[model samples]
Target: SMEQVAMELRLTELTRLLRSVLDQLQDKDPARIFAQPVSLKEVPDYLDHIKHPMDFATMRKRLEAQGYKNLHEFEEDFDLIIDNCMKYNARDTVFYRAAVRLRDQGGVVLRQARREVDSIG
Candidate 1:
């Protein structure tokens, strides 16, 4: 018999793995600056400066699609949020600094995922 991992286990574990990281970020980021999509009307230059926009809201909706095959997907999207802030906002800006802090904490949560979830689902 082939070694079979239960289908429900993979789905639930993946959902929990991804959801926990998103929730952690939502709670940590003060003012929820990175919580939603950037407004183009409010900041017209946003699209020009940041080609690929990312936020907690977008990730949550995306997560609902449930197309995740690897944990690496979450890693990349999380990095996108950090990198976007780093590039779009100036060094002295609070948001850019916030991104730096979030990056460190995000890594902690990601590591915790590996500990809680046995094997990659």
Candidate 2:
């Protein structure tokens, strides 16, 4: 059915878009920071602050699982990663600043993807 095929194609774009976003975040020094879940032992207070610690590697697993229903769904978790970092690490902290940069660049990728395909009803 065309609807079914059309639905499938939308998901393909969704998957690729998420991968591209993650790859951009994974490119620099921050990559090492967000690659895995933050070390609770190393940052014990992190658990005290961030209840849901999201990360890039974890996002990769979810992407492979293909659970994200839309571009926005990916954005939710992507933002979560940055949100958690900003929450746990102070604004002056290097980790917090890194998250800020990722968030900005991430916004660019996200905005571009939406512009490319604004066909959804």
Candidate 3:
């Protein structure tokens, strides 16, 4: 149904936003955090299980408490982390390429999800 699809799409966008921000700051398994990172196809379920909105809010508060003045701090961490991944995987370009591909794919889906929601509205 349209409603269900709209709801799912909204959840996907939110999940992607949270994942993109949180992934850089944590050492957790991406598989567990995103369930299947190739496309994040399982993000809805993963977000549901994690209480997505509440958890994201909690993480924001926690980061602020830890002296992250704003989202720029997270962005800095994210950039540094991605740079480190690429640097460390220089010999095995597969890892760096895979990360870049995943990030691109995630951006694609995030845009699609927003479009879906807008269309439904």
Candidate 4:
């Protein structure tokens, strides 16, 4: 039970970290930075779950069970949610790794963002 409890605690900690990142980025253009329609942080009510502790996979699985059509429906945004947990804020190594694993698709998306911006004048 300690592992479970620890995971929960880490999730909460990661959320706090993410909120701080959001605060820092709040002054930036929400749309270009974190408010794109595909970005959950920009989705208004999407990130509210951060207020509580919940297993990442379990949350997605539960959403699937609820007939939420393709757990990836809001993936891009969700990945950014985890990205904040990984690079910008995660203090727990285990939680950080889990967040990275949970959003493996991010590398490609992030690279795309980089390329798009790099191509700019």
Candidate 5:
């Protein structure tokens, strides 16, 4: 489970930031799982973006390079998008917590035994 492994890795990073983890809650899907991007409006002012000290201009350049052109799809893929973002800023406490929430929410699933890294903003 990429989301689960990602969450664990993220929390390991967050603990280094001296931030405490609260209760993690997520939207659970019993049968099948799916993930989509978040809103375009969520791009610059996202919670993790605001909480973490990230390099904005470089983040923008990298995100734009991905050709994330669909606004609604972005919104729909919020879980996946946030997961990538959290991994990008591995030490962001808020991002790590949020990633945990997404995983617990069953946002995405591990399909095959393959390693892939998404260069997120």
Candidate 6:
């Protein structure tokens, strides 16, 4: 139990250290999810929350095609799409919002869409 507490304390201190680093690096971009310190447990959800516009619909298509079956799958393309969009034109807030939508809505949204289609047909 002592060892476990020690490890937990070390992890907490490390998390604090990383959060300090994140605070120093955050900019005016509210879309920047990493602009603040995130808990180790929250990192996956944080990654899930990072978004841009250009990737959402296309990513949904990918999900429908079974290209992305889970958050991890979507996140792989999410990172790539973010890089491509940033390189092309990071000033596009529309794109950023769409990305957020895709990240936030991708899997469940696609599932719902498919279910609707199934019921309708």
User: Which ten residues in a row are the worst by lDDT in model 2?
Assistant: 112-121
TM-score of each: 0.84, 0.80, 0.35, 0.29, 0.24, 0.30
lDDT of 5 by residue, 4-69 (tens): 898765544433221111111123312112123334474665555544332323333433444233
The candidate scoring highest on TM-score is 1
Error of 4 at 75 (Å): 9.9
lDDT of 1 by residue, 18-97 (tens): 88777887777877988888889898999989889999888888877765556788778888999999998999999998
List candidate 1 segments past 4 Å from native. Answer: 1-9, 118-121
* Model 6 Cα lDDT, one tens digit per residue, 27-114: 2224653222334374455445534433334544554444443334544654555454444335657655544454454445435544
Clashing pairs in 5: 36-76, 36-77, 36-78, 37-74, 37-77, 37-78, 38-74, 38-75
Clashing residue pairs in candidate 4 are 30-35, 40-77
Model 1 scores worst on lDDT over the 10 consecutive residues at 1-10
Q: Tens digit of lDDT per residue, candidate 4, span 21-82?
A: 33333333223233322235554554554442233333344343432222243334455556
Candidate with the greatest lDDT versus the true structure: 1
Candidate 2 residue pairs in clash (backbone atoms < 3 Å): none
The Cα local distance difference test for each model comes to 0.81, 0.79, 0.45, 0.43, 0.37, 0.44
- In what order do the candidates fall by lDDT, top score first? 1, 2, 3, 6, 4, 5
For candidate 4, the TM-score is 0.29
The predicted structure with the larger lDDT, 1 or 6, is 1
Candidate 4: segments with Cα more than 4 A from true spot:
30-75, 78-121
Off by over 4 Å in 2: 1-9, 28-31, 119-121
lDDT of 5 at 86: 65
* Model 3: ten consecutive residues of lowest lDDT: 31-40
Give lDDT for model 6.
Answer: 0.44
| Model 3, CA-based lDDT | 0.45
